[PDB]
Design a protein around this ligand. Structure first.
Ligand SMILES: O=C1c2ccccc2C(=O)c2cc(S(=O)(=O)N3CCC[C@@H](C(=O)O)C3)c(O)cc21
Ligand SMILES: O=C1c2ccccc2C(=O)c2cc(S(=O)(=O)N3CCC[C@@H](C(=O)O)C3)c(O)cc21
Ligand SMILES: O=C1c2ccccc2C(=O)c2cc(S(=O)(=O)N3CCC[C@@H](C(=O)O)C3)c(O)cc21
Ligand SMILES: O=P(O)(O)OC[C@H]1O[C@](O)(COP(=O)(O)O)[C@@H](O)[C@@H]1O
Ligand SMILES: O=P(O)(O)OC[C@H]1O[C@](O)(COP(=O)(O)O)[C@@H](O)[C@@H]1O
Ligand SMILES: O=P(O)(O)OC[C@H]1O[C@](O)(COP(=O)(O)O)[C@@H](O)[C@@H]1O
Ligand SMILES: O=P(O)(O)OC[C@H]1O[C@](O)(COP(=O)(O)O)[C@@H](O)[C@@H]1O
Ligand SMILES: O=C([O-])C(=O)[O-]
Ligand SMILES: O=C([O-])C(=O)[O-]
Ligand SMILES: O=C([O-])C(=O)[O-]
Ligand SMILES: O=C([O-])C(=O)[O-]
Ligand SMILES: [K+]
Ligand SMILES: [K+]
Ligand SMILES: [K+]
Ligand SMILES: [K+]
Ligand SMILES: [Mg+2]
Ligand SMILES: [Mg+2]
Ligand SMILES: [Mg+2]
Ligand SMILES: [Mg+2]
Lengths: 436, 425, 418, 424
């Protein structure tokens, strides 16, 4: 009680009853479970991104607008099916639906476009079809590649080479789908931007009763590395034909978030099912409940104990900002970023505070959806003559969007993360600001 | 040997943090210990045949659930007879005989305020037919449990009452319900209709945590392997759900339509068995034991004091088993509440206690049938030897293993007070 | 490695003790301040210069002995010795002046009222108030200091059973506490003093307020050039307990080896500070420190967390009153807290907080406030390089505010030296 | 119930704390120690403490081990001091409530190899039946082997406590501890051989490693130095004694304080008073957790039984753990887990009864009844002897819970049973 008494008097007992805060203050994991409360409502914005596979059931512009409003952050295009012409039309429809909300950043929502490859088949390396599909991705400006059946580090180097010099900025998320991928996980993660636990093939390649071990291990190692991890396949499977999921399906979604997944995915549920929008809404509702139930006290302590010492100022500032946000129950951490890296380094410490990432790069704004708890804001104004004023305008842009979009209210504390000079790699400042 | 320390997720068990424990989980680290989470299979048209029941017992069914929401008393009495016939077909080999509990799951109160007249009749049927457990539907408060207990009468005092929590009131009045119940069932079917579907996992994890803290059995139920009612293999979400119920701390996992009416009853039991064994090896015992110890209050009860000493001793030597003599199952339950990795082999002469201890995780009941020796110390030794011989035959024990033996200072229940370190010869 | 770093990485306190190494040399500057009692043996300007060089941070004047004329001459000699090093601003060491009252004897005595008035007139920085037994005793001392002594720190001396029992109410209204073991060891059983000491140090560490361990720490050094094994152990254990300051009484006031006693406390404190198990200490201080909406409070925890992440050589903080440095000190960083201040009094008083190294800023003011802040930060860096705290390539954490004036600290910056 | 008053004594509010910092904050000067003093006191016998009458007062004050410093005196002088110790000890054999075994320890003069004088003094120790040797200036494992060889054919049961007095002993500590029965942190010479300001690091490290190895460790020299001439110690001296106990020392020592000082009895009384206070202030929650986590897994039934018995004693706040031991080993393995319950060791070996004083919290009871023909009856008689002695001495009352540790067959090395008994 003494460690929360003054803040309880100031913020109120009602504030400390919401978002599983009594369970968050527990001294043991067992006590944390015992304090979980179905009446404790989630307040924070949903931080785990939803990837929706785009197909016949979710192709139209009108349907895609509903999916964006329901919570879709990443549109996946499965190159195992369809054609280049079919997928290009789906991509154009996604972009049309996304841009229909570009009226003001107080209502704008960026959406990443991901290409999921067919894979190597019986062959041992990049398939000729994968080379053509990866070239298509670069030509159509995809943000992410979900590379199928990655079995070793040279597989991701081959994917990187097929993207050429013009696809240098595309994120490569390696899909682990077999025994070799699990066994060579460390070398694959080292050269990848992130990982997808592709449970469909994994559950056929290894005993079905061992998939949960591979999932928890890969999520834990990705959390330790500070790299995005996606949990995929059959999460809400029954929703392909039914309007409501099973008890095992809601449990699976909640447990993927509690495991530490940055993203959760919908495959047949959105590509061909009868309830694509309802499936997105269900993942959204479960993820908000599960994020509040995360035991941050042990998680943050373990992420600190395991993360090595760092002499990188972006990394040092990120841990200081997350520590400061927990100390004051900050509503948000506003960070200026060019490539998304400063937001990713904040996200790896799993703050409860939303990470509002203000960027001029449309691609970085789409790609940061891979990192849990990062809310991208695309800044469109031309640069101010004085760099310090251009920085301040970008911070104010995040404070006004947050104030008028629920995130922030007058009296809230926010942590602001900036650098000392223009350009990528110079984040080194953390500021505590009171919202007026 | 090095091979021993590579199996049963032992590298992940030695980790200094939960995060490093997850990072060390290995799909090639094979489970060695016997499956400790009990499987409850609901009886119906797909599982009533005496020959089909024999296959389900071999696959791992520990408790047979009779769902009184369907069928007459004549139907349930035939189910009881078929279950008992299949169980007793293995009684000719006492070292391998597996007791199977019979649980009666009530229809419930309906639009009524408390115990239905149908439940009063069904509960009296349960006592008359010797059921071991009652899964009481829609328990909303402590007086619902007292009413179930009263309907069982003086002849049903030994029947275990597991309260099913199926609505908001049951979740909110959980503490008072657990206090008077023998255990709890997280009845997710109705719970997921009574409260928002996205909140069920919070109610499940909370109730399992509180039951683990109280040392009382908790069952995770409904739609765990739902797709297996019509498909031979479950979905990725279903295997995950079963593994996570075990990781949460559930003593039992349940099958409903998967065994009552589906096309794969035996395979659904085999699937729960396979998943539970993998998930039990992945339990982070270092944190779990530490937290259970820290939260368990001080006690002046010798059974409770001996149990924590025996669990601490078992962890110190990597004991293959804790062999406990028990009359009511209580000494085995008090060992089980500390979640030892060592199997708790409970030797009992009570056929009912042998069936009921399946509610406690990691308790393997052995029904001892020999008449008592004239010298009490010799009768205790013969039972301990029966435990060792059954354990060797079933694969729990080998020569050279260390075992912890928990016994008492005089006959009758309530006098457990001794813990002994024994080398298997 | 140096500064007990293998013992610092240990996963348990037991393994930390097992890894302590007599060959692991201390590198960090000595964090625990030394209070030396000034008397016949340590009065001369030449002797005081050697005591400052040996490590004396606070000069204590015991008003139980001497006279106003005697103590005023001791104060003038301390100031003369301190100011003899002012010609080199990058290495100048401020020294606080503390007045220790005679006490109530058999409420606030008339002699204490006169002595407290003397302290205000002579510009003392701290009052060590004798025999504090309740909150109203502190209020009486505060009232006797009047309107001109509002800035003087009151450190309540706990010397009897009532002071121990009413500790919480005394700490609440005091700036800090002194565990006055001489009288405490007569007032309560001698074998219970260590319990009162460890409890008071723990509660002061929890409150983020300075605590002094005092009396008979190196007693045998009054006549002998080397202390006993129990005395070196006592000094090391007071530092390991969490004391912000350690004190010398007869050892410096009347003994034959005043300079050697200061040197011995300095040598032991440096060794003991490196042996502190920061992994458990920081985690416990962090877990127990309440949630806060005060930006100075929030910035301090962020800065200490950042310093541990990069093994920062120092945390450079700008402070008017010393408060921003005190809030960093309460988390016990391994990094030195270099406090750059224009207030000569705050520079002297900040010696009460463990690990705070005060730098008195005497350079011309900049016209642009941002440029003025930058030059005070570069002054912290140049003084740090000269004193051995910093080297080129080191990382430092810089803590500053958004606007001039006290109470506005809200910024933490990661800076690479040179 | 035990009552709220029970939970206010022996620093029990500080014992329940969830952090070490909270534990310190909850220490209470009004919380009185109830348990018997568990840290043995070693007193150096010299001119000021040699007489039978003075030795009787020192035994009553709390002396458990009599140290004879072979750096001074002679064989004749030390033999007379030993005879006086034995006469003073045996003067209490007519009262079970007052009788207490007292170990006799020989501290060598010290050293190329073992000195000629040390060979003769070690032979004197064997001939006079000493229990312990405090071996001066041990620098390496071969120094311990030389002392062991010198203990001739009749003295292999004598305990060798290696004194660490210089840089080489500190640096070769692990190899020395491996072959020694225990260690003495000999701070006098250590504070001359290494910088004085580093002695506390060597002390804390050696105590921690001995606690980890489950071997006795003695903190020695200048603990109450001023009491050689003054009736009361300094604030630094009481602090030093309390901190040696909090560090984890099994024994604390008095040298000039008892050998030649003006207040030998008062110095013993002061160490007794401080140790009792400091033992109650030990943070058992973290200590037991860390001893468990660091101690490797074991297939030795005595070690497995010991941890189970200590866990059981903490669970019920057992007044005592009664253990049957012939060599002292079963009591030593209980002691290494630092139970708050007193370890009452029932033995037929007079030497083991004296030597177990080296292990913190072991209260030896020498049993001299003739053996019963039925072994189970002889075991029950010794268990009841421990219970009746415990009731007589104030350790136990009817209604208390005790833990009893025995083995399954006679002879040393078979401990494998732990029982929970209600005192009737
Ligand atoms: O791009 C698609 C697509 C493209 C063009 C026509 C139909 C589809 C389609 O039905 C579809 C279904 C799915 S799907 O429903 O997720 N699923 C169908 C069965 C096979 C699964 C597999 O790849 O193993 C996939 C998609 O992932 C993608 C598409
Ligand atoms: O101010 C002092 C002083 C002032 C003028 C003459 C002599 C002295 C002196 O000897 C002295 C000794 C000491 S002292 O050595 O610490 N000590 C002497 C004995 C009584 C102790 C007590 O107060 O209980 C104090 C001082 O603390 C201060 C002075
Ligand atoms: O056995 C003793 C003894 C035996 C015969 C005559 C005198 C003494 C004596 O004074 C004495 C003093 C001490 S002592 O007081 O501990 N001693 C003081 C001076 C020498 C020191 C040293 O050895 O470094 C320690 C003893 O340890 C032992 C004896
Ligand atoms: O997260 P990234 O990719 O390193 O970008 C962070 C960068 O953004 C800034 O805050 C502002 O940079 P710009 O003015 O170039 O947009 C820099 O100071 C910092 O280096
Ligand atoms: O677990 P419970 O029901 O308390 O049974 C434990 C009892 O079993 C025993 O070990 C054996 O007793 P019985 O010979 O009566 O079967 C008793 O000593 C002990 O009291
Ligand atoms: O520690 P204090 O007393 O609050 O002083 C800290 C203050 O110092 C500063 O860094 C610099 O202030 P000045 O320019 O007034 O000296 C402020 O921004 C900040 O509020
Ligand atoms: O501690 P030690 O020397 O191993 O002695 C323990 C032995 O004492 C006993 O409890 C009793 O043995 P004895 O009857 O021979 O004295 C044995 O069962 C056990 O092995
Ligand atoms: O490839 C996939 O996405 C899978 O198998 O889940
Ligand atoms: O009754 C049940 O088992 C349920 O609702 O899940
Ligand atoms: O006044 C003091 O310093 C004391 O009593 O210790
Ligand atoms: O020999 C000793 O005891 C010493 O040197 O401390
Ligand atoms: K694909
Ligand atoms: K039912
Ligand atoms: K005074
Ligand atoms: K000697
Ligand atoms: Mg696949
Ligand atoms: Mg139901
Ligand atoms: Mg005083
Ligand atoms: Mg010596």
């Amino acid at each position: 009680r003494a460690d929360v008494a003054q803040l309880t008097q100031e913020l109120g007992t009602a504030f400390f009853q919401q978002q599983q805060l009594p369970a968050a203050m527990a001294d043991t994991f067992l006590e944390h479970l015992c304090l979980l409360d179905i009446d404790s409502e989630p307040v924070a914005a949903r931080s785990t991104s939803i990837i929706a596979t785009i197909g016949p059931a979710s192709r139209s512009v009108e349907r895609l607008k509903e999916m964006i409003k329901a919570g879709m952050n990443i549109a996946r295009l499965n190159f195992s099916h369809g054609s280049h012409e079919y997928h290009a039309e789906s991509i154009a429809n996604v972009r049309e639906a996304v841009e229909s909300f570009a009226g003001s950043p107080l209502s704008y929502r960026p959406v990443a476009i991901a290409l999921d490859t067919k894979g190597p088949g019986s062959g041992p390396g990049l398939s000729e079809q994968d080379v053509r599909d990866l070239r298509f991705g670069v030509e159509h400006g995809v943000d992410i590649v979900f590379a199928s059946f990655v079995r070793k580090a040279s597989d991701v180097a081959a994917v990187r080479a097929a993207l050429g010099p013009e696809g240098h900025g595309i994120k490569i998320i390696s899909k682990i789908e077999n025994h070799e991928g699990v066994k060579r996980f460390d070398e694959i993660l080292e050269v990848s931007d992130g990982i997808m636990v592709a449970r469909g093939d994994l559950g056929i390649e290894i005993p079905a009763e061992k998939v949960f071990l591979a999932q928890k291990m890969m999520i834990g190692r990705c959390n330790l590395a500070g790299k995005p991890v996606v949990c995929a396949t059959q999460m809400l499977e029954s929703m392909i034909t039914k309007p409501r999921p099973t008890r095992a399906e809601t449990s699976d979604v909640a447990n993927a978030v509690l495991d530490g997944a940055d993203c959760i995915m919908l495959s047949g549920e959105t590509a061909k099912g009868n309830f694509p929008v309802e499936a997105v809404k269900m993942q959204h509702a479960i993820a908000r409940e599960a994020e509040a139930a995360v035991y941050h006290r042990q998680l943050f302590e373990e992420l600190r104990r395991a993360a090595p010492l760092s002499r990188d100022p972006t990394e040092v500032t990120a841990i200081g900002a997350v520590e400061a946000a927990f100390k004051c129950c900050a509503a948000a951490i506003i960070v200026l970023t060019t490539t998304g890296r400063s937001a990713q380094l904040l996200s790896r410490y799993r703050p409860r505070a939303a990470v509002i990432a203000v960027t001029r790069s449309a691609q970085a704004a789409r790609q940061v959806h891979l990192c849990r708890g990062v809310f991208p804001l695309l800044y469109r104004e031309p640069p101010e003559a004085i760099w310090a004023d251009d920085v301040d305008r970008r911070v104010q842009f995040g404070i006004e969007s947050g104030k008028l979009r629920g995130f922030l209210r007058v009296g809230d504390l926010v942590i602001v993360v900036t650098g000392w000079r223009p350009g990528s790699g110079y984040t080194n400042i953390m500021r505590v600001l009171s919202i007026s």
